[PDB]
Structure formats: structure tokens, C-alpha cells
């Protein structure tokens, strides 16, 4: 079929346009966006500090396995302040930071899959979270969830002998018994004051001062999670699941390296 | 469409709880309801008409 | 020469653009800015200022034989029109906190039937621009396609300002192919993270001009092709009137 | 009156893809109206139809091929394997989309945009060769398979659709190892007639190459590709 | 006839804000009538409307 | 026939989830639906009729 | 409102021949049409009727 | 990734795992015993199994 791509729009065909053929359509629903993101993927491993169950919380990380996590598919952490509250970043940090270093496994915390494939500028969804302890023995976990933009310094212990995470009317979740399945599951609502969230980049600053640092739009996450527990030696994986995902404005995905090899790829 | 959920049973938690509540704002604004409940302090005797009146200055 | 159902005019206030070789107006997302008030503002907007709804025309740069594929120039909006070249638009913009608008653009570039080459013109929401939201100065292939990472981030896979240009056509666009056209016309609606924008710290849309097939010609043909643009705010609606921004720069 | 239950052997397991929901902890939360929003899509197929650039001359990729002033029937201008894994397609949205699924079916659309001078003239032979007898080695062999002749003139591009010819209803998206002499055949581009021109005009032109899904195209079973780093 | 169940991974967790009730242990308890009572409100918005003092010269 | 399943209760997961989906292909092909959703870029002003026209060359 | 259950003594057992199904993990998967297929049987009795050879002089 | 992953591990589990997977071969029907053909059109002869004929 002759065409004119300059218009910015190109008529779609099937083999039927130029040759003696037939259309070969067959229905499927796995390509709907909602269905595609409605599955769990991991964002990293976390840890609890010793005796956090009965004392003041304090930022801390085990092996670049911190204490709290921001609910977002984007990068966060910054292995250089593994002992500071984590923050959202605008780049992913490799495993090492010098030539001889390695890219995997990554040091920052993110939904690498989401990052690798999110062809949209903005999205909206609810977040389903799964906490999975890397142990099949008893495990106690206390979780505090704070909506985005609310107080996130659960530092003052107000009650003698009670974790400072376990304070107030802010949602707290706790699993700990000899008959539990150890894992924790729950879904949080959408709390950004924003109408829709930037999926990759947000071309603006944080203050009107233009104290220039573009990338992330403020309060564009699902909140922060703080952990306290009893097995300070067991790490747990945190997984995200996008419930009723909606995306707006297609945009490009992550670059894939030219096979300076064949005329095809594979796996790994 | 929908996602990946295919349970026959009616969701045990109702929607306003299972999901966020999509609201829609109209361009031209919306009027608050008139009253938020029935709590109120009341001002009485505000005005007039009736007393030991019109002996009262003009 | 240029023809018939390809001859087209667009009147904006006291402004009118004409082309004798169009390929149509691509309306991105298939919608136009409605000019409706932001539902997040209690104040009534100042809207429909005729002096503001017109075309602002200025030059982008020069296209030469030297540009390589995918080198580009970015024009951040509304920022580019917030200064002196923005007329009453700029003047009004600098005294309001918030602006809600769509964009209607025309980019221009002529050559001859003996020149060969093509540009890609697209408009993109949240495209990564300069810090200071200014039009790029020279053509660059800067930070394509993996974004800008920190110095030390030696092994980082990529940064969030990544841009895989192999897929730039996912954005509302049109090609300026010298054998075919002289102008490109695009229009985009209002899109943002919120019902209206605090434009001061956010350049939500960027007009991008990129080379995709480098300029070629034989001797005696014109050697440098200027690139100019006409930009018009589509039914801008302003809210939150205060004193002037001022350092407008 | 308490109800008797039988606990299944799989008690306590977590399934990453369970077709069900979990416990809500912060109900009755109204959201911020996002009704002014535009540009939403709901199915990837909705945008898989938009053409993106094929990379030529890998790893020094360029979005185009070059036509010359000579027609060697022995020399293809391009040869693409029809595999959503071709390093050729590696950065097209089609390929980036497709790599998250196990199988595909339907039409693939190769779009060519002529970018040379208006004064140039020429004809190309674009062919699709199904597998079985290896890739064609001359335009004469290609011409034996599915092909189209593209004549240069007023209209700038040409949309070539490779018909889904296959024994199975679906074809695997990605390759495990590398696919030989296989894959699903080849798209080859040849000059029929040479690029001709008048005096004062360049003697070669660039042809932009893009790929997209046809209305026919389908994808099924979402998975994850092998992780990679763009750098 | 006993019913087969699948135990979810989150078995045993406690949610501080669960949209649900627990086990009642002392039923059928009548209360002391409080029907003479006045001044009740039901929404904070009902009283957020009453002006209180701004602190100057902190 | 059926297999070895003899539960009274309605399957808790619906079929499209409990089982694979048997589809059938017709010999002569099938037409894709016309549209996959409502996302679209639009080309306007494509044609003519109406302007400061017929001063315009023949 | 959480429902009270009595756990049977056999809690946790696996029965190789249980007349019931388990958890589906990859729903809504359409299959490749196999409608051109022939030669299917459904009961072994359908083919047990075809004579095969008796071995003599074992 | 987003590839199906299952995990059981706690002090109160029954230790076993159960689940059912769909039919994902691109083939219409699967060879039950033997498949009289090769893996490539090269006929780099090795008959027996038809490619992607598992679950």
C-alpha cells in the first residue's frame, strides 16, 4: 500500500491490502493494561533493627536492606546513606561504583520491571503490598503505613516499652505467632494529592524557588512503610501489585542494547 | 477492561472499602450542603416586634 | 511548486499563518484544549483575552549538512513565551500563579526539489528539558538514550530522564520531509498531573525538533536551511492573580 | 454452629499472580478528581500499531537504509529476519512490547519513507520469503516469494505487510539460544531499477525504515524478558 | 461435608484499621438510657466552623 | 465425560481463570475488530472545501 | 462478623485422588484452536473392542 | 519480574504447594509418545520431540 508517513498517522493493514490473503484475528485479553500490571513484582529486600519491637524507631539498614520503604515503583535508596531515611532518586545505582564493579544486583530499590517497561507518562492505581520473610520459622513483623505527605519520623517513643511505630491512629499491621504463615498482605488506597502520577519523569522543581532539581513531583508516591520485628537476622522481600491501573499518554521505553553479535537475541 | 481477578463470590468488603472512591469535580464548582449535621448554638431575640412598645424613641 | 488541498491558512488574532504545502494538522490525543476552568480553583479565571490567543513567531535554528540523526533542539512551554517575546501572553502569565492551556504549533523550513533530508517534529508531555526551561541553543545528542546519571554512578543502568529516541514517534508528531513539505502543524490539549499548572516551576510540554535523515544536496543548492516556528496558546485560562513574577528570566 | 472446614495441603502459600484481592486497610478514601485527563489507552494493541524505527547497521544503528544508483540483483539493500528478536527490531515499540509476552500472531508492517530529492526516481522490490529453503540470494529468488514493487513519485512512503504464514496458530516471541536459518523467514529489500536523477542532484538517498503491528496482530501470556542493562 | 478452605498467606495478621468487628463476649447488655442528652455533633466539620484565636507575637 | 471432580459448590474461581479458554479458528479468517480502544491521534484539515477560495490556481 | 470455623483433624493432608481442583495461577489464557483435529476417543471401551494379537509359543 | 512465582514458608503452613497451569504450547495438540520430525528445517536430524511441546 502506498502511504505518506509525514502526516504523523499511518493507515493500518493486514496482508489483505496488497496480496490475495485473509485476516487472521483471534481474541485475547492479556494485552489490556490493567491485566498486565495486576500481578506482583519485587522492589527489594528489607530488614528490621534489633529490639525495634520495644523501642524508638531509627533509620537503619542491614546490608543495604533498610528499615523503611517508600511505596513507589521508581528508584529510591542511595546506598551511600544506608543509614539515613531512604529517598526517591532519579537514577538506579549499579551494584558497584567503579569500572571493575558490576551492574547486578542493583543496590537501589525499585520495580526494575516497571522501570524497564512503562510506555506511559502518567498513571493512577491502588497498591497491593506483600511482605515475604525469607524464613520458614516464626517471624514477627510490625508495620506502620503513612499516607504520602504525612508525618514520617516515627522517632519518639511515647509509651514505655512499646515500639514507636506502634503509636497513634496511623495504620499499623502486626503478624507474630507460632501458627501464622509469616507473610503479610494488604492494599492501600491512592493518596497523592496529585490527580495522576508521573510514571517516569516530571519536568519541574520541588519549590517555586526553582532550586533546580527536576525529576520528581512531590507527594507522587503511595506513602512510606516502617518496619520493626523480632528476627533482626531475617530479611524479607517487599512486592508491589498495581490494582486497577490506568495510564495516559504513550511514551518511549528503556533502551535495549544492540546485539554486537547476531541478528537476534534470546535470554539473559 | 479488568485486571487479574476471577472470583465468583461477591467481594466480602464493600467497594468503598476495597477501592479508592473515584470522584469527579465539575469545572464550575459545587455548593456545600447547607448543613454538616444538626449541632448548633442559636441566637434568639436578634430582632424585635413586641414589648412595652412604642413608648420607645423614634 | 506547492498545491491545492495543500494550500492552508490559520487565523489567530491579528495573526494568520499560510502554507502552500501542508499535510494536515495532527491533533495529539485526538482532542483540543477546551478552555474550561480548573475545578481546583475558587477564583474566577481571566480567560478569552484576544491579545493572547495568537501566534508568536520566532526562529529556532539552522539546519545543516552536519547534523547527525537524532540530534535535537528542545523548546520548553510555556516558558519560551513567558518573556518579552510572549507579548500580552507573557505579561499576563507573569502575574498569575496558575495557567491551563493547549498548544497549536507550526514549524517551518524550505529547501528545494534538489535537496534531500527530513526532520521529525514532536510534542511531548514531561519531556526532560534544561533546568532553567530554556530553548536549546545548539543541536545536541545529549543524554540520549539512557538519561543523565551521576558521575560516580559507574554501573547504574540508567536515569529517569531516559529517552529512547528509536521510539520518538509514540509522541504526537509529523515529519518535515523536504521532498514533501515545508511546514508541519500540530496541536495538543491540556495534560498535567493536576487540573491547572503552577507554570513557574514546571515546563509540562516540550516542542522537539530532531534530524532523522541528514541534509544532502549538490553544489549551488542552498546550504543552510533556517528553521522557524509559530506558537499559539490555545484557550489559556489564568488564575491566582498577584504581583509580577519579576525576574522574568 | 461454628462451621467445620478441611484445610488444604497448600495452606499458607502466596501466589504472585492470584486472581484475587487482599485485605483493605484504609477504606472510604475519596480520590482527587482526575476527570480533566486525556490521552488514556487501555490495551497495548491500541498503540502497538504506531510505527517506530528499525535500526540499520547495528551497532552503529541509523534509522534508514541507502538506495544507490546501481541495481545489483545480488545485493539486497536490507535483509531483516522476521523474528520479534531480530537485533534489527530491538528498539521498536513492537519489539519492546512483544518481549513481555510468550507468543504472537498476525501481521507485521514494515513502512519505508523515501527521503531523497523530489527530482529522484526509482523502483524497489520488497519481498517476504517463508522459511524452508533458506534466505534468497538474489532479487531473482526473492521475486519467487511474496513481494511488492514500490515506485517513487508523489507519494512518499510504502507500507509492506508480511503475511502471517505459519503451521501453528501462534509463533513464539523470543528466541532461546539464536534461531539458525530459521526464525520465520526474511524481508529483503532490493533495487529493481537504480535511483536515477538529473544533473545537480545527489546520487543516493536515505529511506527511513519503521515497523508496527497490523490490525491482525495479537500477543498472549505476559511474562518478563531476561533482565538487562541499557549500558 | 466439612468445607474445604485455602489459607491465605497473610494468615494470623492483625490490622489496626480493619473495616470489621471482632468477637462479642458479653451480649444482651442493655444500656442506661441517655436520651435526655443534648449538644451532640457527628462530624468535625460541624464545629470546625467556629472561630478560635490566632496567636500573635509568638 | 468429566473427570474426577464432584463438588456441589460452584467453582469459586470463574472458568476463564480455572481453565484455559478453548477458541476455535475458522478456516477463512476473521476480521479484527475495527478498533482496539479509543486512543488515537487525529489528522485534521486533511482535505479542503472552504477558504479565501477560488483566487487559488487551476 | 469474621466467621467461626471448626478445624477437622485431617487438616493439611494431600489426597492424590481428591475429587476437586486447586488454585489457578495464570488465568484468562486462550488456547491455540485445535478444531481441525480428528480421531478423538473418550472412553477406553471405545477402542477395547479392536482385536490385537495373542502370543503363541511364548 | 512478573513471571508467576509461588512461595510458601511459615511455621503454620502444611508445607505442600498446589496450583494448576494452563496449556501454553503454541502447538494445537501435543505428541504423547513420539514426534517424527526434527527441531530445525536444517534436518540436523534428531527426531523424537516436537519443540515447545511441554507445559
Short mmCIF file of C-alpha atoms in Angstrom, two decimals, chain A residues 15-122:
data_model
loop_
_atom_site.label_atom_id
_atom_site.label_comp_id
_atom_site.label_asym_id
_atom_site.label_seq_id
_atom_site.Cartn_x
_atom_site.Cartn_y
_atom_site.Cartn_z
CA UNK A 15 -1.98 -8.99 4.37
CA UNK A 16 -5.16 -8.27 2.64
CA UNK A 17 -4.25 -4.85 1.28
CA UNK A 18 -1.58 -5.83 -1.22
CA UNK A 19 -1.92 -9.62 -1.67
CA UNK A 20 -4.57 -12.32 -2.01
CA UNK A 21 -4.91 -13.11 1.70
CA UNK A 22 -7.36 -13.21 4.63
CA UNK A 23 -7.29 -11.52 8.07
CA UNK A 24 -6.29 -13.81 10.86
CA UNK A 25 -7.66 -12.28 14.01
CA UNK A 26 -8.21 -14.19 17.23
CA UNK A 27 -9.24 -12.66 20.54
CA UNK A 28 -7.16 -12.39 23.66
CA UNK A 29 -7.34 -10.16 26.73
CA UNK A 30 -3.93 -10.37 28.19
CA UNK A 31 -2.85 -7.21 26.44
CA UNK A 32 -5.12 -4.92 28.47
CA UNK A 33 -3.09 -2.63 30.65
CA UNK A 34 -4.96 -3.41 33.83
CA UNK A 35 -4.47 -7.12 33.41
CA UNK A 36 -0.82 -6.66 32.58
CA UNK A 37 0.13 -4.77 35.77
CA UNK A 38 -2.28 -6.66 38.03
CA UNK A 39 0.50 -9.08 39.18
CA UNK A 40 3.12 -8.78 41.92
CA UNK A 41 6.82 -7.93 41.29
CA UNK A 42 9.54 -7.26 43.90
CA UNK A 43 11.17 -3.98 44.76
CA UNK A 44 13.99 -5.19 47.10
CA UNK A 45 14.96 -6.81 50.41
CA UNK A 46 14.44 -5.07 53.81
CA UNK A 47 15.39 -5.59 57.40
CA UNK A 48 14.29 -4.80 60.90
CA UNK A 49 16.59 -3.48 63.58
CA UNK A 50 17.27 -5.33 66.84
CA UNK A 51 14.69 -4.87 69.54
CA UNK A 52 12.69 -2.45 67.42
CA UNK A 53 9.60 -4.08 68.84
CA UNK A 54 10.04 -2.34 72.09
CA UNK A 55 11.86 0.92 71.41
CA UNK A 56 12.19 4.06 69.39
CA UNK A 57 12.43 3.60 65.67
CA UNK A 58 15.61 4.80 63.91
CA UNK A 59 16.66 4.54 60.26
CA UNK A 60 18.95 1.71 59.72
CA UNK A 61 19.83 -0.85 57.13
CA UNK A 62 21.22 -4.35 57.35
CA UNK A 63 23.01 -4.97 54.04
CA UNK A 64 21.60 -2.04 52.21
CA UNK A 65 18.48 -3.69 53.45
CA UNK A 66 16.79 -0.89 55.30
CA UNK A 67 14.16 -0.28 57.80
CA UNK A 68 11.51 1.68 55.87
CA UNK A 69 10.48 1.83 52.19
CA UNK A 70 8.71 4.41 50.06
CA UNK A 71 5.77 2.83 48.19
CA UNK A 72 6.72 3.61 44.59
CA UNK A 73 7.85 1.64 41.55
CA UNK A 74 10.67 4.22 40.91
CA UNK A 75 14.23 4.11 42.25
CA UNK A 76 14.96 5.02 45.88
CA UNK A 77 17.71 4.34 48.49
CA UNK A 78 21.18 5.57 47.55
CA UNK A 79 23.43 3.05 49.12
CA UNK A 80 25.66 5.81 50.38
CA UNK A 81 23.09 6.64 53.16
CA UNK A 82 22.02 3.24 54.05
CA UNK A 83 21.78 4.57 57.49
CA UNK A 84 19.59 7.55 56.68
CA UNK A 85 15.96 7.56 55.84
CA UNK A 86 15.62 6.50 52.26
CA UNK A 87 14.82 8.80 49.46
CA UNK A 88 13.49 8.75 45.92
CA UNK A 89 16.21 9.00 43.36
CA UNK A 90 16.36 9.88 39.66
CA UNK A 91 18.78 7.10 38.70
CA UNK A 92 19.39 3.48 39.56
CA UNK A 93 22.71 2.61 41.24
CA UNK A 94 24.66 -0.32 40.00
CA UNK A 95 25.98 -2.96 42.41
CA UNK A 96 29.48 -1.31 42.45
CA UNK A 97 30.65 2.17 41.63
CA UNK A 98 33.86 1.68 39.76
CA UNK A 99 34.67 0.11 36.39
CA UNK A 100 35.62 -3.22 37.87
CA UNK A 101 32.28 -3.13 39.65
CA UNK A 102 29.09 -4.83 38.49
CA UNK A 103 25.66 -3.67 37.50
CA UNK A 104 23.69 -6.53 39.01
CA UNK A 105 22.40 -6.89 41.57
CA UNK A 106 21.26 -3.31 41.94
CA UNK A 107 21.69 -1.51 45.16
CA UNK A 108 18.81 0.88 44.98
CA UNK A 109 15.21 -0.31 45.49
CA UNK A 110 12.79 -0.23 42.56
CA UNK A 111 10.36 -2.19 40.45
CA UNK A 112 13.00 -2.92 37.78
CA UNK A 113 10.33 -4.49 35.52
CA UNK A 114 8.04 -1.47 35.74
CA UNK A 115 11.06 0.72 35.05
CA UNK A 116 12.10 -1.38 32.07
CA UNK A 117 8.55 -1.26 30.61
CA UNK A 118 6.25 1.72 31.33
CA UNK A 119 5.19 3.28 27.98
CA UNK A 120 3.04 5.98 29.54
CA UNK A 121 3.70 9.45 31.05
CA UNK A 122 1.12 9.34 33.85
#
